[model samples]
Target: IREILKMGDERLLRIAQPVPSELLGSEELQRLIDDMFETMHHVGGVGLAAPQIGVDLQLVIFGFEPAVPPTILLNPRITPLDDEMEEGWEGCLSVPGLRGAVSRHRRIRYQGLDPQGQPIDRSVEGFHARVVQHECDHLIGRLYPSRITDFSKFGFTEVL
Candidate 1:
């Protein structure tokens, strides 16, 4: 188990700044992507944004494949790909075991640069879309708490 910081640490949690593709297209970005995947998978999270690691950059790491291919996105921007709301519970790596009920569009249209800085547009729906939106929120200094329907209904599991 690792000793992750609580929300109060300024360096531990902050708004992610946007990193230009020029900087992202490097071995450093690859290393950070690995670190992000390792950290998120190690903690059992499917998605992680750079800010979750105190990096404060508009980058996100996501993996849905059971084998965790680990997609690295830079400057990801999301658009509504479909018309629907999928309400689900979400937990954050930085926030530990706490989860809040959140509602999000069932589909999303996202545009971002890949690890090699190639432009890609992703149109995703269903639970997968929820995952992308969750990660997108982190890039803007927002959290699941901001989208909670009933704050009092929030629940927790365990925290290390």
Candidate 2:
């Protein structure tokens, strides 16, 4: 069973490695990707990073919605499109019942590849941008709690 690693586990803070180019279409990695999607949906989260499951790879998936649609991003590089930021409530499967307000780039262009190594480049803003930024942060050992500046805006989901 692929279990989601909770916060406070050292694995959640480790830097995830990039998906090796040659293994992009390999069966083992593909199975991992498939499991990630279902796991995220099962937990009712919009996005998930590979490290959340203890896999040290730069893999991320998002778009569990009507607007963004489902997509997988492997070894993503995010480029901010503007100097704007937006703060909104965010939660994570790893963080469990806690939620916090996070400021994220309002506009960005993310470059990555599909499971098959096909190039993916698209500009996005609003919730799409926030979700992408949040997921990508996990690749570099960052979490939403650290992004929150106002303690007043952070709390347990049931208490907030």
Candidate 3:
């Protein structure tokens, strides 16, 4: 039986943990991606990470933003475009029932491997950038709670 995954909990994720196995570029990767998308859809999620479902393979799936195409990231890394940031509502599957308006970058570039293990570079702007960074954090063992500047100003956004 599958154990219950805590929604909106501060998950202990590490950024530097290397992904084991060739699953990132193998046929199983597609199955995992499919499952993640299904899970995200069933849970009302906009994105998810490999580690969130107990796979430490540096993979992520995020597509809530309208500006970018829906896609997956395998072993992604943010190269950092600029320091300008924007405040927006952020939530997590690990941390349930809470949402926060946190400041994230306006524009950022990232590098990740494709299903073929080829390098893919993307430059993101606005809310798309935030989503990308947030999902990427999951691959590296980070969460939205750490980026929160003020807990007093944030609360549960049940309406979302």
Candidate 4:
């Protein structure tokens, strides 16, 4: 497992670089993916971003069966399927001990490359969609708290 970058770490706020599709098959990249999954699972996270591990790659791994199914997104692109939005509580591994209510699309269709660099397209809704949007934001130098519009609903996790 690897150390997860905390919220105040500057690396977590920068735009991550794209992993060239051809490099997806490289040993180093594959090892990194394995380590990321290890670290994420160790911390009990539903998803994780490359930037969260101090890696500047546009990569995110999320779910496994029961939640959203294990997914690896490289250079992902999210396309909201509707104008509808839902308010949900969100917490980040990078920003621990905190949770906030943020608005997200009710449904979305995301397009991205799998670890093999093949196309990955799916329509997701509810928590499945929420997790994808949360992970994707990391690639663009964003955290969920930045999307919060109501301070009244944002605070410590234990208190929330």
In order, candidate lDDTs are 0.75, 0.89, 0.74, 0.90
**Ten-residue stretch with the least lDDT total in model 3:** 1-10
Better of 1 and 3 by lDDT: 1
lDDT of 3 by residue, 83-131 (tens): 7888888888877888987888899998887766777898879878888
Query: Which of the two, 3 or 4, has more lDDT?
Result: 4
Clashes of each: 2, 0, 12, 0
Q: What TM-score would each prediction reach against the true structure?
A: 0.84, 0.96, 0.84, 0.96
Q: RMSD in angstroms, all models? A: 3.2, 1.1, 2.9, 1.2
Which 10 successive residues of model 1 have the least lDDT summed? 1-10
lDDT of 3 at 126: 86
- Residues 1-160, candidate 2: write the lDDT tens digits: 3799987889888888888888888999989988998788887778889999889999998875437768889989999999999999899988888999998999999999899999999999998898999999999888899899989999988898
lDDT of 1 by residue, 1-160 (tens): 2334456567544666778656766887778877887787787778877876767778887877624345788888889966778777788777776877899998788898888878988787777788888888877767787788877658886521
Stretches of candidate 3 exceeding 4 Å from the true structure = 1-4, 7-11, 16-21, 65-67
For model 2, the superposed segments whose C-alpha errors exceed 4 Å read: none
